[model samples]
Target: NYNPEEQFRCTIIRGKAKNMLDNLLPAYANIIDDICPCDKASFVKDFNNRLIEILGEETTKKTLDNHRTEIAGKLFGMFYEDDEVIFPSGRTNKYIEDSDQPAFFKDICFKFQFPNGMDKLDKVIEKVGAKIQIRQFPYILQVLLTADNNNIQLSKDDIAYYVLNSLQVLQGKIKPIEVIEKIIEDRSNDITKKVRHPGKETSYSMQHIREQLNYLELANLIRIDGNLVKLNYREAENINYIAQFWGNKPEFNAYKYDFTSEDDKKSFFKDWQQYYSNVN
Candidate 1:
């Protein structure tokens, strides 16, 4: 008794959410593919006509007009989000690194008084083996600034975890020899280590952890004077940006966003309505 496709058609004809357009476009494409069979060119022409009939000319024009403004605002925000884009404060925190726009990077070099030219930056980026794209500069900037800032180092864990785990044996100060000895003892008796080497065929030593501590010392992620070792502010600030550099790369199901509630979904698109407070 209920025709689901007809309901879908009705909703698409009236809905206004631009994000929803991505989902709705495919549904219309599928409907066209199933109900109408013709050459690609003819199918496209017919599709346009059918869409116009489903959504009246006035509604189609209104949606298009709103979409242009929405896209413009998003693009404008990208540059405005970086304060240094307009002013040169010489502050370490406000540099643009991930933008792919070549002109923007050139502007940064010019405005920020970079010691090296764009070509030098390009060569440095190549040496690190990162792709030469918009996203690449931000990562390279981090590495270069780390070299210069005397602070900030890459870390797989937050500063708290690193500090806690690295110095659990000695509160604020640690002797390197004692830390090395403890590392060996823990690795040798750890259950996880034993599980990984079930046959007892593999043997390991504290050499790997020793090298890590040495590297951390040179990088200033950890402080070392004489034989005393401790964590510092460099590791704390560096870990924040490095850890969340690209935001979360999440795995998600596409169809989960498909709202089933008729009234709720409809209300979400109300902003795209043809008339807003008769302001038109």
Candidate 2:
């Protein structure tokens, strides 16, 4: 198998990966039904209609039927039980059993910025049951932690390289400090569209990292000021807290299903209906 160039590979933010998150969160949360559910067709139609109402006719304005809501809705999907997202009803999901914590959408940023105890992130990761999902908040915080440990000001290339090194760090192929050293060594220049080594290896570029950072921007972790990556000191502690308990290898499972088997198809569909990981 070939190694794919990795950079937070989540789609919580796509296309114009800039300061879209602040808006995306509302774009996602606003569309959520306040106190009821609707028919599948009505649900979808209403969602798109809300996109324009919520987004102020920006991102969703481009597409008659866009995925911004579906993608954004998935981030809060930790509460969903075995249910098709066609007409997601958080009111009925197991997460709402208490009606105490309230729907995640009501206080998304609260739960997001403050996992309270690191276990909440694990709850989400396990709930989704994905094989190689990244504990996004922790991972982003770790990357920012590296910067905070340094000058507190991060560059686009350094952010990109740090993420690349993270993928390598998972396999013991590289060390964290060394990534910082590489950044210092290249301080004289700046930071990937595609990193090709003739015939050796090929990987996606920093442009993608540049785009992906948009999610962090929305989360208020870091702000991308053009090429200058600045830390949002307001959320420093929460950032450190979430990024502390990071891991990947301890749990993973390969999904197997027989496409021809109706039962397996249903099984796959069930697993997929409620699946959520940042972006689509």
Candidate 3:
């Protein structure tokens, strides 16, 4: 985590695919009002109180971050900030269209690594930039298409292996299509043979990669029939636009009120007093 900024990573709001992330919105409005003018202690408390009413007392399948409430919070963060409603993630309550609808990964995650994304790309390895954070999804689309076009077959592990390679491509190392053609035609088994090994301390496991796959399938970006993946090329241009222009992480933070900062806490207190006075 020390070099967190060194690479663009993907994350999801840990849940079943497209399982209605908006269930917490109703709770968010009341929570925001109570916690904002904001009640620092009660953000989690109030949210938890209303959460059980929906998800039914968490579940047996639990990790540190694998809770309905935790997932809902991240999903909520997509539409609002860490603290307030003023910083809407531009995600409406409804799904408008595939191309135009607010994307959970693209809209919620404002950071990534991209090809030729930075200003004229002079600083070669300084790939720190932002826009879409589930950065591997698009490359997954490209890889599936490449495999299809080349008349190749890819297993789930194969997809992960290629996506693992995509990080270097994003950092301006090699062209992806070329990598696919060269490897699949020349040394086919190399594509999926024992793809990786993780030590005791690692963030992304093989199972986590499967969860990321769920997001792409939910968004209609890729089709996973069994363990094999196919490209949803109809939305290719949208992914292309994101993969090309968006970079590492966002510098512009809209959540101005810092609850932890002493000065920010005081200033926002004054601002909140005036803000609450004029509230609807």
Candidate 4:
């Protein structure tokens, strides 16, 4: 019996995918919260308020109230802000704004960029905002680069969760628990808006997403345990060093890679006996 919930695929990523995504929770507590926040009501109120201000109160409020935070995050993210975002909490919404690069904090307009870690980025992001990007690379990089001076570090597990979540969206499959149906239900106001809402949809898909996720897991670059993914320690350090190198070398740019069944077959024969490889 095949368990649909079981992750049954294997893949590869330049031999380092496993290391990058392990033990990476602390660095991304904020990003994780943004996608699936526990206090969704505040997000809804905040998002709706922002939207209503743009499209008129009645029309905007009538559009949809469910998943307003998630939807608003996506909507606002798509548009480059004409002005700097001001966060009342003495910080900008890193999830939706950018740093004031060169200037570091004041009058920011782009995500903070650093070669080593997340402290520099965080300090600035704390005062300004982070560029709202939607994948592991951009998402983690945004945090990692900004908070470089902080103790925050990206781990293999972080990459796994980040990649898996992103891949799930790309594949368009969702377990009942992971699916947020409230957004769709909100459309009762006007069923004519039948268009699919990517924001409303879970961010899980296959293709590059699944393939990439599987590869990283197989390489042990990341780990999976009953739905959680994290980075391993050794790999995490290596990732930090790589980030330091940044554009000086093109090897890291080879982050996206392909894995073949032949690799798995060879590993099967090498890691186990011939009998094991052929056993039912």
My TM-score estimates for the predictions, one after another, are 0.17, 0.56, 0.55, 0.21
lDDT of 4 by residue, 110-155 (tens): 1212111112223322312221112232233233443333333333
Give the winner by lDDT. 2
Please state the error at residue 67 of candidate 3 in Å.
5.0
List per-candidate RMSD values in Å: 23.2, 8.7, 9.5, 23.7
The prediction achieving the highest TM-score against the true structure is 2
Question: Which residue pairs clash in candidate 3?
Answer: 35-38, 35-39, 112-248, 129-247, 129-248, 129-249, 130-247, 130-248, 130-249
Candidate 2 structure, TM-score to reference: 0.56
Residues 191-270, model 1: lDDT tens digits: 11211223433222222223333334433444544433345455566533432321121111111222356553343223
Model 3, runs deviating above 4 Å: 1-38, 58-70, 73-76, 79-88, 92-134, 165-167, 170-172, 186-191, 198-204, 234-280
C-alpha lDDT values of all predictions? 0.28, 0.44, 0.43, 0.29
Which lDDT tens digits does candidate 2 get at residues 1-280? 1122442322232343134644644444445534225445565677667666644666544453535333433334432323333443342243334432222332233223211112233333432342333443455556567756876556666555554323443332333445555555556464322333345422234443554465556556677898777767787676666566444321222135444576865554345433332222
Error of 2 at 246 (Å): 3.0
RMSD of model 2 against the true structure = 8.7
lDDT of 1 at 115: 12
lDDT of 1 at 278: 12
Instruction: Answer with 1 or 4, whichever has the higher TM-score.
Output: 4
Q: Which ranges of candidate 1 are over 4 A from the true structure?
A: 1-26, 35-37, 59-280
Judging by TM-score, tell me the better candidate of 2 and 3. Answer: 2
TM-score quality measure for candidate 3: 0.55
How does candidate 2 score on lDDT? Answer: 0.44
